[PDB]
């Protein structure tokens, strides 16, 4: 049947959002949207690229854009001139100042978005292809992670109908909430149709960017302090 | 003029499908004239076609049984079902729509 995005469930318990700004109802939405406009307006400059992914913040009274590259020398450019052009492209679109951001991707075939995409680019494209997926899986295993699945669809092999193939190595739990992970799903166009790719990577039992709860309050809290009791 | 379908209701299944035309008499000595609709994009890829090949087949059907003169024929509407219909089906359908419809309607 159908499944949840691993991740999306997760957000706020194990995984950060994605964008990170405040907003709300009178400005929420919008924002959301600017985002949507950044994404489409910046990402066509990025895509040419080794950027996997972007995250938007927002600080502040600006916009933002953190970019994950992968690579970063290809988006920074000669003496930083680009990152200045990137951003000027932010911004633009957006109504505020914006800033770029850097990020580094990572072990690039670890990811997923960048691994995927690497196989979506080969299928666009197309080349003998197949483979790729095998690989990627090998890779990722490899660079890091405890398992990876890949799946490729749309249709495959040029076709009249639909289709789909997959590979996977290590591992990959599904219901485990938890942790973390990762994930992913990206598409795409070719002269026969849309082509689609999924990737799922299990990192093991490791903690995410957050988590969920904060550390214990009771150490802390302690009863020995003076207060109070409001109220004054 | 109209319409004809081959649809059935008693078995599980319906065997659908169907076409509607305008067949109208013309001035004497005008001969045989053609219009579609639905062949702009919907009837269509070889189906425009087919219905015209269906009329040419229909020249070996009728009430007396043979040739058309005229008259103008217009393919106003219809509906195929994708997993059973083909150019075709139309098509075989279209000279049955033309014969029935001519019988209804009188020659």
């Amino acid at each position: 049947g159908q499944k949840v995005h691993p991740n999306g469930i997760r957000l706020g318990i194990v995984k950060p959002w994605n964008s990170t700004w405040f907003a709300n109802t009178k400005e929420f939405a919008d924002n959301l949207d600017s985002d949507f406009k950044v994404r489409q307006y910046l990402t066509k400059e990025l895509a040419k690229a080794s950027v996997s992914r972007i995250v938007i913040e927002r600080p502040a009274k600006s916009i933002r854009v953190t970019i994950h590259t992968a690579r970063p020398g290809i988006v920074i450019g000669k003496k930083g001139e680009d990152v200045e052009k990137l951003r000027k492209v932010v911004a633009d679109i957006a109504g505020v100042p914006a800033q770029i951001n850097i990020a580094e991707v990572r072990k690039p075939e670890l990811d997923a978005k960048l691994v995927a995409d690497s196989i979506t680019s080969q299928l666009e494209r197309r080349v003998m292809f197949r483979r790729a997926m095998k690989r990627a899986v090998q890779n990722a295993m490899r660079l890091g992670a405890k398992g990876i699945k890949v799946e490729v669809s749309g249709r495959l092999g040029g076709a009249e109908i639909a289709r789909t193939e997959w590979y996977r190595e290590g591992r990959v739990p599904l219901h485990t909430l938890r942790a973390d992970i990762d994930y992913n799903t990206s598409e795409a166009h070719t002269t026969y149709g849309v082509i689609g790719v999924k990737v799922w990577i299990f990192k093991g039992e490791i903690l995410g960017g957050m988590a969920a709860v904060e550390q214990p309050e009771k150490p802390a809290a302690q009863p020995k302090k003076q207060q109070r009791k409001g109220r004054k | 003029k109209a319409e004809y379908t081959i649809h059935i209701e008693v078995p599980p299944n319906p065997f659908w499908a169907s076409v509607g035309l305008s067949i109208e008499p013309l001035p004497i000595g005008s001969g045989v004239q053609y219009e579609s609709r639905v062949s702009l994009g919907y009837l269509n890829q070889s189906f425009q076609n087919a219905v015209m090949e269906g009329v040419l087949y229909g020249c070996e059907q009728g009430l007396y049984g043979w040739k058309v003169t005229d008259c103008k024929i217009c393919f106003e509407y219809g509906l195929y079902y994708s997993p059973v219909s083909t150019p075709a089906d139309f098509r075989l359908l279209s000279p049955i729509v033309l014969e029935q419809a001519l019988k209804k309607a009188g020659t």
Binding site: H5, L11, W17, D30 | -
Partner: protein
């Protein structure tokens, strides 16, 4: 979704604004409660009639990004199924799946 319906709505916003928005302040006191009457008749009430559309009735809005109508939220200005897409992903800050 069509570019004509998108759009429209941005035209509408927008036209509205010149008219509605400024207006509305007049409607309400020139007809409704309020008004004299000289007002309302209409007219003076044609100020409302000539622009419409620019009216809030409509202006609405809706989506947004997809444009879509009669299927959007809104608090986000977005379709929904596009809200959801998103959420999976985390493109809206603080927005998650859910459970209770």
């Amino acid at each position: 979704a069509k570019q004509s319906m998108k759009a429209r709505e941005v035209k509408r916003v927008a036209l509205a604004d010149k008219y509605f928005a400024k207006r509305a302040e007049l409607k309400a006191i020139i007809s409704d409660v309020n008004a004299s009457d000289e007002d309302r008749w209409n007219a003076v009430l044609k100020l409302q009639t000539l622009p419409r559309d620019s009216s809030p009735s409509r202006q609405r809005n809706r989506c947004r990004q997809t444009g879509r109508p009669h299927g959007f939220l809104r608090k986000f200005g977005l379709s929904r199924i596009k809200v959801r897409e998103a959420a999976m992903r985390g493109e809206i800050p603080g927005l998650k799946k859910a459970s209770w």
